[PDB]
């Protein structure tokens, strides 16, 4: 993005914030951090929000079965878990039927 004027950057930021609004509807702490982050005179808050995201995304890892501190690398582990749980669901359905 180093070679793009500021107006387009503002537009992408606006669209991303619009998406985040829907995305973080459920959470309250992340929602509050986002609501703080839009003050143009406190830029660091935005950065903090990102940290607050990753930080949060780490605590809810459920590290009991996951290890990757980086949430980006935990998508594979969640996919593994969904596949395993689909197998377990099939087994449970058969057991309930019998």
């Amino acid at each position: 993005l180093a070679y793009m004027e500021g107006g387009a950057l503002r537009s992408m930021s606006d669209k991303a914030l619009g998406a985040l609004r829907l995305a973080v509807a459920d959470n309250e702490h992340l929602r509050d951090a986002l609501r703080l982050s839009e003050d143009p005179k406190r830029p660091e808050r935005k950065v903090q929000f990102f940290i607050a995201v990753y930080q949060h995304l780490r605590e809810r890892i459920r590290q009991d079965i996951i290890r990757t501190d980086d949430p980006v690398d935990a998508i594979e582990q969640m996919e593994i878990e969904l596949a395993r749980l689909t197998e377990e669901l099939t087994a449970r359905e058969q057991k309930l039927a019998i």
Binding site: Y3, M4, E79, A83, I98
Partner: protein, 247 residues
Amino acid sequence: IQSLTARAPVWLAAQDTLNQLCEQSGETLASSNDVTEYMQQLLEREREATVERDEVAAQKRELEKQIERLSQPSGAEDSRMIALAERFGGVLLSEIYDDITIDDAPYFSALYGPARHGIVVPDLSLVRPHLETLEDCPEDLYLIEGDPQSFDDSVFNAEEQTNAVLVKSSDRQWRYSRYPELPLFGRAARENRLEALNLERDALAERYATLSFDVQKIQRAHQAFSQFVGKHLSVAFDTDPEAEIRE
């Protein structure tokens, strides 16, 4: 300078995408040809993992089929044994011997032979009409005559031997039943054994899930590489503009 600046953003985005893609892999890419050999290695790993996954899946399916075969009403040839059992006022012999001990279970199973799973019908004349109708049934259906509640032991030409039983099934004909393990009769701990089968299949399913996830990961990596090359090759491995622009 303006030409290089115009070229810049495309090159920079390409470099970032390529770096992410390669770092995701253990290897670092340096050429279009190198990307092609990486694709070939990806295909090799995929065509391997799929074979192991299918083999594990076949083993798994066999395990669940075996587990089910022991399920209901009392683990037996319940595919048609059910209808064959309630359609006539009889009771499964295996169920009749459901509570026999694990020790007497092998002896009685060997004694009864292929007739272990038979159905007790004191008349044998209820099945006489329906016999012609039966075209969907186990290739060898077994029936015994007596009181289902208190059936008297089938009279046999039995002859017990060490961990086995000889029997004379018909004139000049002997069947020698070696004491089986984990028999048909005594279907109380056989439920425990099908539980053991479930335990066994747990690891099979775990391994199958790991193989399936590996297959999915390789597929997604290949698709990402394809999309990359679709958007990316035009500027891949080209010189850095930023240094030129600064100079």
